[PDB]
Structure 1
Amino acid sequence: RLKIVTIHQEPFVYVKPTLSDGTCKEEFTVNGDPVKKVICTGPNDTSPGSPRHTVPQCCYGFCIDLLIKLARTMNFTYEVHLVADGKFGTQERVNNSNKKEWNGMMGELLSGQADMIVAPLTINNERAQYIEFSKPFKYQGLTILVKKGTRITGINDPRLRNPSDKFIYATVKQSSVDIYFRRQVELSTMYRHMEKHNYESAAEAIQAVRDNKLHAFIWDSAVLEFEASQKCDLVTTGELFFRSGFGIGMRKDSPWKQNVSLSILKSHENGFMEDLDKTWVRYQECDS
C-alpha cells in the first residue's frame, strides 16, 4: 500500500471534517455525479496555541480524482495523509547546522513518510536534483491575486519592483516561489520584501487579500484563477510568469515513474484532464 502525501489546496485538494460517524458527507458535482472522497489523515487545527491532533478527514478534488485514476490504472492500493508541517517543501539548514534537509512534502517523500506526492506540486530543477517528477499533469504558472479595483499590471508593476510599506505583497512560506525570485539577481529586493510577510498557507493569504490586510498575493495561476473566478471580490492580474508544470513526485530511480508518466500522457490524450477541468476548475459563476 503506497503512502500518498498531499496538501490542502482548492480546487486540487479539498479537506473537510468527517461527519460524527467517521463517514464523508455525500455530495454531487454540478452534473449530478458523486463526488469521490478518500479518507486523509492529517492535522485538523493549525491555530497557534491549540493542540495539534492527527485525525481522519475527507479529501477530494482534481488531484484526488487523478489519484483514484492512477491507482486503478496501475493497480496499486494507497493511503493518503496531509503533510505534517503544512508545506510544499524548500531545502533548509537543519538544527542550526550547515547540513540541509527538505521540509514539506519534499521532506516526507525523501524520508519515506510518503512514497508519492500527489498535489499541485511545482516541477523545478532544484527539486529535481533530489526527487523525480512525472511529466506535468497540468501546465500553469505564477500570477497575482488582488482585490477587484486594485491598479496593478503584473510582476513588473513599479509598486512591486519599488516596494514601500504602503503596498504589502507576499507568497506562501516554504514553497518554490521564493527560490524562483532568489534565482534571478534582478528580482532581489522583491524576494527580500516578501520574506518579511509570507503566509503559512495559500488560504490564509487569499483571506488576507479579501480582508484588505494583503494587497497582492503571488501564487500558482491554477489556484488563483479558480479562487478569483469563485469569488466576485477577487481578481488576478498580469501575464502569467515562471510558467511551469505540476507533477507527481517520487523518489529517485522510482519503479513507478515511467508508468505514472504514461498514465498522465493518456489523460492528456483522451480528454480526461479536460473533464477534470470541467468538474473542478471551470463550471459556474462566482458565488464566493
Structure 2
Amino acid sequence: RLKIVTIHQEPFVYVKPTMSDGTCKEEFTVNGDPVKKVICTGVPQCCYGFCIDLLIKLARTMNFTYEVHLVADGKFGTQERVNNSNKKEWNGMMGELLSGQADMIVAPLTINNERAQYIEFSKPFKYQGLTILVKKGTRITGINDPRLRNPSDKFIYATVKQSSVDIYFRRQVELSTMYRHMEKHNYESAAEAIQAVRDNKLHAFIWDSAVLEFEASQKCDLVTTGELFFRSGFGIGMRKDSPWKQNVSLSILKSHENGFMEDLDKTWVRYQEC
C-alpha cells in the first residue's frame, strides 16, 4: 500500500476524532451527498475534504491501495539548518517523502523551483495564489492598493507570523515597506486573524486565496478583494523516480476537463449562502 502523507489544512484536509466505536461520523454535504472519509493516523483519526476526494478519485482511476497518515512535525516542508550547523535538510512533508516515510504527498502543496529540484510535482490540480480578506464594504484593489503600498496605523494589514506568507514578504526587497508594517501586526494563527477582521481589529488579512474564499462564502460580513497575486499551483508530490508520475498527471488533466476539479471547488470552497 502507498504511504500517503497529508496535513491538516481546511478546506483541503479536515481532521476530526473518530466516534466512540472507532468509525467516522456519517455526514453529508448541504447538497445531500455522503461525505467521503478515510482514517488517517497521526491515534486513528478522520480525514476528509478537497484533497481526500481527489486521493480517492486517483486511487480508483489508477487502481492502487493506500494508507494515510498526518505529517509528524505538522509542516508542509522547507529546508532548515540541523543541529546548530550549516547543514540543511527538508522538514515537513517534503522531508518525509524524501526519507521514504511517505511515497506521495497529497495536500495543497505549493509548487516552486526549490522544491522541484528535490521532488517531482504532478500537473497542478488547482491554481494557488494570495488574496486579501476585509470586512464587507472595505475597498482594496489588491496588493498594489495605496493603503497597502503606503502603510500607516490608520489601516492595519497583516498575515500569520512565521507562515509561508510572512517568510515570503520578509525575503522580498521590493516589499520591505509592507513587511515593516506587517511585522508589527502579524497574528499567531489564521483563525485569530480572520476573527480580528470580523471584529474590526485587523482591517486586511493577506493569506491563501482558497482559504479566504472559503471563509467569505460562509461569513456574510467578510469578502475577499483585489486580484490574486504571487500565483502558482498545488500539485501532488512524489520522488523523481516514481512510477505513478505520468499517470497522476494524466488523471488530474482528465478531472480538469470533465469538470470534476470544479465540482470539488463548489463542494469544499465556494459555498452558496453565507
TM-fit CA distance, 1:107: 2.3
Contact 2:38 2:46 in 1 (8 A): yes
TM-fit CA distance, 1:222: 1.6
Deviations 1:257-283 (A, max 9, x none): 111111101111222112222322234
TM-fit CA distance, 1:211: 4.2
Contact 2:214 2:271 in 1 (8 A): no
Contact 1:89 1:103 in 2 (8 A): yes
Q: Secondary structure at the match of 1:238?
A: strand
Contact 1:87 1:173 in 2 (8 A): no
Contact 2:214 2:270 in 1 (8 A): yes
Contact 1:136 1:247 in 2 (8 A): yes
TM-score (norm 1): 0.84
TM-score (norm 2): 0.88
Contact 2:218 2:271 in 1 (8 A): no
C-alpha change, 1:77 and 1:275, in structure 2 (3 Å) is same
Contact 1:148 1:234 in 2 (8 A): yes
TM-fit CA distance, 1:119: 1.0
Deviations 1:178-199 (A, max 9, x none): 4543554211343455456655
| C-alpha separation in 2, matches of 1:283 and 1:113 | 35
Deviations 1:136-173 (A, max 9, x none): 10123210112334443321234433445665543345
TM-fit CA distance, 1:175: 4.9
C-alpha change, 1:206 and 1:94, in structure 2 (3 Å) is farther
| C-alpha separation in 2, matches of 1:8 and 1:81 | 11
Contact 2:217 2:271 in 1 (8 A): no
Contact 1:86 1:201 in 2 (8 A): no
C-alpha change, 1:164 and 1:5, in structure 2 (3 Å) is farther
Deviations 1:94-136 (A, max 9, x none): 2222111223222222222222111111111122122211001
| C-alpha separation in 1, matches of 2:93 and 2:158 | 21
**Range 241-250 or range 205-214, more displaced:** 205-214
C-alpha change, 1:189 and 1:99, in structure 2 (3 Å) is farther
Q: Name the count of aligned residue pairs.
A: 274
State the partner residue of 1:186. Answer: 174
Structure 1 residues without counterparts, runs of 5 or longer: 43-54
C-alpha change, 1:108 and 1:39, in structure 2 (3 Å) is same
**Range 220-229 or range 190-199, more displaced:** 190-199
**Range 209-218 or range 83-92, more displaced:** 209-218
Structure 2 residues without counterparts, runs of 5 or longer: none
Structure 1 residue ranges (4+ consecutive) displaced by more than 6 angstroms after TM superposition: none
| C-alpha separation in 1, matches of 2:219 and 2:88 | 40
Contact 1:14 1:59 in 2 (8 A): yes
Q: Secondary structure at the match of 2:174?
A: coil
Contact 1:104 1:174 in 2 (8 A): no
Contact 1:9 1:202 in 2 (8 A): no
Q: Secondary structure at the match of 1:120?
A: strand
| C-alpha separation in 1, matches of 2:75 and 2:181 | 20
C-alpha change, 1:4 and 1:171, in structure 2 (3 Å) is farther
